[PDB]
Motif scaffolding. Structure first.
Motif, PDB file in Angstrom:
ATOM      1  N   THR A  40     -38.709   5.523  12.767  1.00 33.01           N
ATOM      2  CA  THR A  40     -38.455   5.475  11.334  1.00 33.01           C
ATOM      3  C   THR A  40     -37.765   4.182  10.912  1.00 33.01           C
ATOM      4  O   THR A  40     -37.228   3.451  11.740  1.00 33.01           O
ATOM      5  CB  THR A  40     -37.575   6.660  10.903  1.00 33.01           C
TER       6      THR A  40
ATOM      7  N   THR B 284     -42.422   4.518   8.292  1.00 35.13           N
ATOM      8  CA  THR B 284     -42.415   5.110   9.619  1.00 35.13           C
ATOM      9  C   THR B 284     -43.658   4.723  10.401  1.00 35.13           C
ATOM     10  O   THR B 284     -44.766   4.701   9.867  1.00 35.13           O
ATOM     11  CB  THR B 284     -42.321   6.635   9.537  1.00 35.13           C
TER      12      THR B 284
ATOM     13  N   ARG C  74     -33.454   6.306  15.226  1.00 31.20           N
ATOM     14  CA  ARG C  74     -34.758   6.084  14.603  1.00 31.20           C
ATOM     15  C   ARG C  74     -35.937   6.556  15.456  1.00 31.20           C
ATOM     16  O   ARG C  74     -37.072   6.554  15.000  1.00 31.20           O
ATOM     17  CB  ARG C  74     -34.944   4.590  14.297  1.00 31.20           C
TER      18      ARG C  74
END
Lengths: 222, 216
Positions: A88, A17, A71
């Motif tokens: 992410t 991340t 994400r």
């Protein structure tokens, strides 16, 4: 003074991340109704908008792009005048310069103030700091070779910023090994070589390395 | 939705040129278009906003318009510094709401005076040789247009391997820079009496030469 600036890791491993932070100041009386966006740009490619958060209201927006929409998170910390992007499952294709940008309220919308951008490389390769070598000299050229580092970027100053005229720092070469090298040169009057000290200051933030190298006269100068 | 711009545009100094940006009812058709100028390697800057307004500091030669679902940036009197990438953008109320940028237009200002490259060539440093490596560094700056080719010689013979050369990149003065590196072993470096970097720009070739030295 007005400012808007991105910070965060220069290197992230695939699947991990990424967290970037946008910090601003110096325009507190213009923040009513403003919003802050994150926009990225892969090398040599177009700008791509990612997300926006409203500063006074509670709403945020994320791109609909299918490979990004699940994400991305955007958040704010008003106690610090910061906006955070959390992304992410990073992939090498996400390697890019990431910008934050402001939209003022005055339905006239636009990005009137941009940060300088922060480069993010997604790779499994480890960070490596540079090795610096001197490039010994009406005018003379002298410089520093900044060898074999990863990832980008490296910055170079001379004499702790005091010397700026005649300075030229070149973009890096990418070697087949995956490491970068760059050079910085300063052109100076020949006669100043004996009256002026020249030190290149090299900063490789990704590896937390700093190098000062004094450039001396050429040895074995035949 | 996407915004569509031509990938490239060109004009000569003093000409007036336009760059288009095509969208849909839900972006350009119903929201303000803005434009951004960017020198590759540096952050974009706002150039036009609110369809036809000029941000403080932007020269008067820049103007914008929009009609229906297309917008246009006009530059009235091209100058060398106008070589850049230009992006349009607009908010889009469809779906949950999102911003869209066009793909960008790279503007070349043709018909400018040529600027020949300055070339500096460095030999390997004694320190690098002590580290069992040898790098020759050829630095090429202040050239326009932004294309060169580099050839290396060992003595008078062509070098066949070990060269890595960067793409040209815009400098802050709107000319271009590039660098070429020749990697050798210390033994290869000492196996010739000189090496040369020859830089060809718009058919003109110049060169710099360096020579190994030995002090035992």
């Amino acid at each position: 003074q007005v400012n808007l600036r991105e910070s965060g890791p220069a290197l992230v491993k695939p699947t991990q991340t990424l967290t970037l932070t946008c910090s601003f100041s110096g325009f507190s009386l213009s923040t009513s109704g403003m919003s802050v966006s994150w926009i990225r740009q892969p090398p040599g490619k177009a700008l791509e908008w990612l997300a926006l958060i409203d500063w006074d209201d509670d709403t945020y927006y994320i791109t609909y792009s299918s490979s990004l929409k699940t994400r991305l998170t955007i958040s704010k910390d008003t106690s610090k005048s910061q906006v955070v992007l959390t992304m992410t499952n990073m992939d090498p294709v996400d390697t890019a310069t990431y910008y934050c940008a402001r939209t003022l309220r005055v339905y006239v919308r636009d990005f009137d103030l941009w940060g300088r951008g922060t480069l993010v490389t997604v790779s499994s390769a480890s960070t490596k700091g540079p090795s610096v070598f001197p490039l010994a000299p009406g005018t003379a050229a002298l410089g520093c070779l900044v060898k074999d580092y990863f990832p980008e970027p490296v910055t170079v100053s001379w004499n702790s910023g005091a010397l700026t005229s005649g300075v030229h720092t070149f973009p890096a070469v990418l070697q087949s090994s995956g490491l970068y090298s760059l050079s910085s040169v300063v052109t100076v009057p020949s006669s100043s070589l004996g009256t002026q000290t020249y030190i290149c200051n090299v900063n490789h933030k990704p590896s937390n390395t700093k190098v000062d190298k004094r450039v001396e006269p050429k040895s074995c100068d035949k | 939705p996407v915004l569509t711009q031509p990938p490239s545009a060109s004009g000569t100094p003093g000409q007036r040129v336009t760059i288009s940006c095509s969208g849909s009812s839900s972006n350009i058709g119903s929201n303000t278009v803005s434009w951004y100028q960017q020198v590759p390697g540096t952050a974009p800057k706002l150039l036009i906003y609110g369809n036809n307004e000029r941000p403080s500091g932007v020269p008067d030669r820049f103007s914008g318009s929009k009609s229906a679902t297309s917008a246009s940036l006009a530059i009235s009197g091209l100058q060398s510094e106008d070589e850049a990438d230009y992006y349009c953008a607009a908010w889009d109320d469809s779906l949950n709401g999102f911003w869209v940028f066009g793909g960008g237009t790279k503007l070349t200002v043709l018909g400018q005076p040529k600027a020949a490259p300055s070339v500096t060539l460095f030999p390997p440093s004694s320190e690098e040789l002590q580290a069992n490596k040898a790098t020759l560094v050829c630095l090429i700056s202040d050239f326009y247009p932004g294309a060169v080719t580099v050839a290396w010689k060992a003595d008078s013979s062509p070098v066949k391997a070990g060269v890595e050369t960067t793409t040209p990149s815009k400098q802050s003065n709107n000319k271009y820079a590039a660098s070429s590196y020749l990697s050798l072993t210390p033994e290869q470096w000492k196996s010739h009496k000189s090496y040369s970097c020859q830089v060809t720009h718009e058919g003109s070739t110049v060169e710099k030469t360096v020579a190994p030295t030995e002090c035992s």
